[PDB]
Design a protein around this ligand. Structure first.
Ligand SMILES: C=CCN(C)CCCCCCOc1ccc2c(-c3ccc(Br)cc3)nsc2c1
Ligand SMILES: C=CCN(C)CCCCCCOc1ccc2c(-c3ccc(Br)cc3)nsc2c1
Ligand SMILES: CCCCCCCCOCCOCCOCCOCCO
Ligand SMILES: CCCCCCCCOCCOCCOCCOCCO
Lengths: 619, 619
């Protein structure tokens, strides 16, 4: 029955594999990536008419009927996104008259105009002189003086925010303006009677920071700022030291762009870092068949390859398949062997993790590491020396990464400070990197393959963490995936792997939750709205991946030979395409809960294959 | 008569011009460049058998009958050079038995062996474990803490030494060892009974430094060195901030190589700066027709182009010759507009100088600037705006670079400290960058073109400097050229240009000096030995360039229509080749008096053309 499906899905993945032996699916997000690219080019005075065109088609192609842009397909119109996308188009050529500009503008105004958008948006506009810098949350270069163990030192922030903060401090230090030609001036963004509904700090605004900011804006106006020169040079050095191998910073769009602006501001357009940083960009670009051009927020080569292997293995292929070996070998060359920002908290810990992208040695994440090691542990490579060796280094790194509560974070240890969550600046997505369930699950599932059970104290500490975090309805939050279906599936799958008894009450209470949300079409679905409104927890159009996740939670809990179980398998078997793939018009990936959603291209293929492979296992 | 010589020399120059419109002749030095390249590759574990082969040919090719290598063709055997060249070969494959290795070895031993070589040589050997680091002058990372105005702060050193010191501090901080295979171990370098005749500090060794060193060597052995970590990071950042566009540091072989080693030592082999820095090397490499491969100590594109223009112009070509315009345009894009290390002494001075190589914005030199501006001041470019503008910026920068005595330095102002000349480390070439005659001459000659004369205070101050420096025999020292013929020619030519009366006594006393050294063959020649032994001042085999220089001094002093004058012109006319070029088997360029000599490939062509062009002027 399903054998034909799996067989097809298998061959299909094998075709999607690159020559070097790795997998790499485009990472989808929203148009603020492209819109900001447009402004960046304008700032750096490097505009390519041909590129602008591809970006225009794309932007438009993504705008919806109502004339707006959302964070995820089928999501509500987003102000910020729409505003930036608006400015982008108007700069490329679009006249405020045209239908698109019209419908978009309307929505903008009906929301309070520019005054209701996130700091980033207002800041970008400030950069081109369409918004007063004085009304922008200030982040001083002096922040570079806070010691390792001080309130708000750059190391209390999450790896991604840290790099951005450092870069911007330089920018906000000079408050530069790169005037847009009259043709693209966007005054209309202000024309509105609707009361400006401004968004506040993530965890709440304390009158202290509220005032402190005002203080900084005043100090900003003085004629002399002692030691500021040395604060900037510190930020500069700091950035120069961590520029990733591909010329990017952290392998993400944000700090990368800002860092370049920071360099341009310091007349360093002749310096190597800038050059490399600039040309590095092309790698993240993607030529769309319909003539459009999108820019990836980040790239997932490692991740994809890692999961890809696991899937194919659980599917059936030999642990020494010549094709999987290509992957195995490739992965080994990717392992990071040098200290990264994490070292600040673990000086005596030996390097051994992995990164999300191709070359980003200073920021390996616990997630990728776990999956990569585990995936390697399932293979038979020619050089059993390096395979054995690497795994150990990766293993130990992870161990030494375990936070205080036994749960694992993404990039750092105990990065749980609650201070930065109140700064006027941080009003978008996460700013700290505390342990999450999904990550910790992938970790446990990693050790599990080696054989380490609940006996080992490490494991227990984690399980305790998971038990404590479980939601009332037996579900588990999805931090880097959408959502409860993602988390729950992760956990149950992990716990089952670490020897825990699947018969336990809290476990069963989870499985039941799964069955209770299975959509009529046989599959499972969870819309991103589940982050905003709880009524959507486990609700939404059925998707290949999300279905495959819930399917794993069931196969893991022994309920593999069940109704809901077989029902779901049917969905996958049916919905599958003639080529063996699968479609998924929705996002099942999460950047930040409620603020940034991602669509992992491979998920629709890899996970369904992994699930079917595991179903074919239970029989 | 000579006219045909000029027409031929001209058409030859124009042919040697590249497409972009610039001139660029290979810069010759000695084999320590290649020998050190070999060790570098070994250190960085990046050895290319094929390249090793091309290098081997070259090394042998340069070895003389006696089995040694000198600093300049026809020069005495050099210990350091020969030692390094020896180790290089023995590592490539050569067995100590082979005749070449034989003769070399005996010379080396007859000199006291390894114990008599410069610090650099002993250090390189220390790097591969063939010499005790303890017996190497120590340079601590802490030096990075000395403030702008303190004894021995990195800014008291000459631009070239500064960068090397910073890079080495990191290296000497860790005292790494990259063991050579037993096959290439060079113990025989010690086997000798001859008393080790060690070279001391450039300006004498003070018991203070001698003591301080021992002090630093002891401290080096402690278990904890507080703030050293910070010291290193200070040094690294200092390097990462000044890496030049082509990926080198300063555009010179020394700090470049050391800087890369410094990065290796710090596990940064996969950091942008390292990568670029490594692949930047190829540009300085040169494929020799006989199968060899040499590495340029530095490159002189700008310089050549600059002089090339002046020559051709004085020769006859229209100030708007479409070919000289290509040069004119090119040069303009080369002007530096950002602060460099010079800024430390002149914060309010506007950037406007030029560099020696293609892309080295932090180190423009007064010499190149003067020649480049002056050259431009003689052309008629399409964009008279930029031409006018560039000249002013360049000009003004030069004015603001003038030192206290009125003379001009190469890279910095008043870089006359006498402290660094006593450090145990600095025992090779120059370490500070004080004003020189030749440079100041090229500056005066520049303003001269604009019409500024002895009236302007700036010019008088200089003339006073030159008058005071003149040698008893009316000659003038040659700092960056070999030697008194080079300097004297420079000065007289300059003074004549700034309105000074060529009839003056001190002037005449100089001209006479020139006529008195004219060789029988009509031309003039000055061997590099003139730096070591005074009996060689103005003495040596005649060369095209040196002849052309003395010729300019005469044409300038009005003695153009003289015997010695016409005699010399004859030499150039006869010695010329069928293609219009000229041969010059000797070195007429100087890196450091008595320590490092260079051979400028273009000189033999450009200067003879300039001289003839000026002779044809006096008639
Ligand atoms: C899922 C397994 C492995 N993970 C471990 C890696 C996946 C996370 C990388 C994708 C998200 O990248 C980012 C990362 C950061 C951002 C920011 C951002 C937000 C606030 C600040 Br302050 C600075 C940047 N804006 S958009 C954005 C996208
Ligand atoms: C002539 C007009 C324009 N000039 C202005 C530029 C020409 C100077 C560049 C050629 C010389 O380059 C160097 C420059 C420096 C060195 C050193 C050296 C010596 C001592 C220390 Br301490 C560090 C490096 N060793 S070899 C060497 C070669
Ligand atoms: C400069 C000494 C080299 C030793 C490196 C250890 C530095 C301490 O790590 C603290 C964590 O900060 C992250 C550093 O890695 C980034 C690269 O910057 C280059 C210095 O190695
Ligand atoms: C960080 C302040 C930016 C102002 C630049 C002025 C540069 C300081 O001049 C002091 C002398 O050092 C010369 C610098 O060249 C190095 C480049 O590093 C870039 C700093 O902008």
């Amino acid at each position: 029955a399903y054998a034909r499906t799996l067989d097809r899905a298998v061959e299909y993945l094998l075709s999607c594999q690159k020559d070097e032996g790795y997998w790499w699916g485009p990472l989808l997000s929203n148009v603020t990536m492209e819109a900001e690219y447009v402004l960046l080019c304008h700032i750096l005075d490097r505009v390519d008419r041909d590129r602008m065109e591809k970006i225009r088609r794309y932007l438009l192609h993504e705008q919806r009927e109502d004339g707006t842009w959302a964070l995820y397909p089928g999501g509500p119109p987003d102000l910020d996104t729409t505003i930036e996308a608006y400015v982008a188009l108007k700069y490329i050529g679009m006249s405020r008259d045209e239908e698109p500009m019209q419908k978009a503008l309307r929505f903008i105004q009906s929301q309070g105009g520019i005054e209701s958008s996130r700091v980033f948006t207002r800041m970008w506009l400030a950069l081109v002189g369409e918004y007063p810098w004085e009304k922008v949350p200030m982040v001083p270069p002096e922040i570079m003086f806070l010691g390792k163990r001080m309130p708000l030192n750059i190391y209390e922030f999450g790896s991604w925010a840290r790099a951005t903060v450092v870069a911007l401090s330089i920018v906000m230090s000079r408050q530069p303006v790169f005037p847009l030609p009259e043709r693209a001036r966007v005054p209309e963004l202000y024309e509105t009677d609707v009361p400006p509904r401004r968004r506040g700090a993530k965890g709440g605004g304390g009158w202290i920071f509220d005032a402190l900011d005002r203080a900084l804006h005043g100090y900003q106006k003085l004629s002399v700022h002692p030691f500021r020169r040395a604060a900037e040079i510190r930020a500069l050095d700091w950035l120069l030291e961590r520029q990733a191998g591909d010329g990017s910073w952290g392998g993400i769009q944000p700090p990368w762009f800002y860092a370049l602006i920071a360099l341009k501001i310091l007349d360093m357009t002749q310096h190597p870092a800038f050059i490399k940083g600039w040309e590095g960009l092309e790698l993240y670009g993607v030529e769309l068949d319909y003539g459009g051009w999108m820019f990836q927020a980040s790239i997932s080569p490692v991740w994809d390859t890692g999961l890809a292997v696991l899937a194919l293995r659980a599917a059936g292929l030999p642990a020494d398949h010549d094709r999987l070996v290509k992957a195995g070998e490739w992965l080994l060359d990717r392992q990071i062997t040098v200290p990264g920002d994490w070292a600040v908290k673990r000086p005596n810990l030996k390097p051994g993790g992995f990164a999300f992208q191709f070359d980003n040695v200073y920021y390996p994440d616990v997630d990728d590491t776990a999956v990569v090691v585990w995936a390697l542990n399932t293979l038979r490579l020619p050089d059993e020396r390096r395979r054995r060796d690497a795994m150990t280094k990766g293993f130990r790194w992870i161990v030494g990464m375990q936070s205080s509560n036994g749960g694992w974070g993404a990039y750092d240890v105990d990065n749980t400070s609650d201070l930065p969550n109140h700064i006027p600046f941080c009003d978008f997505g996460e700013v700290t990197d505390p342990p999450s369930e999904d990550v910790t699950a992938h970790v446990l599932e990693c050790f599990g393959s080696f054989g380490y059970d609940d006996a080992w104290k490490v494991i227990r500490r984690a399980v305790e963490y998971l038990k404590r975090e479980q939601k009332p309805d037996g579900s588990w939050f999805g931090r880097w995936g959408v959502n409860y279906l993602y988390g729950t599936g992760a956990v149950v799958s992990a716990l089952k792997a670490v020897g825990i008894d699947t018969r336990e009450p809290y476990i069963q209470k989870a499985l039941d939750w799964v069955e209770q949300h299975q959509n009529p079409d046989g599959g499972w679905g969870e819309d991103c709205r589940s982050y905003e409104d709880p009524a959507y927890a486990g609700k939404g159009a059925s998707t290949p991946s999300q279905t495959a996740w819930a399917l794993m939670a069931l196969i893991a809990g022994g309920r593999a030979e069940s109704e809901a179980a077989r029902r779901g398998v049917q969905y996958l078997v049916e919905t599958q395409r003639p080529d063996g793939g699968w479609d998924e018009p929705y996002y099942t990936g999460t950047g930040f809960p409620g603020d940034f959603y991602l669509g992992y291209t491979m998920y629709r293929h890899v996970f369904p294959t992994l699930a079917l492979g595991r179903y074919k296992q239970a029989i």
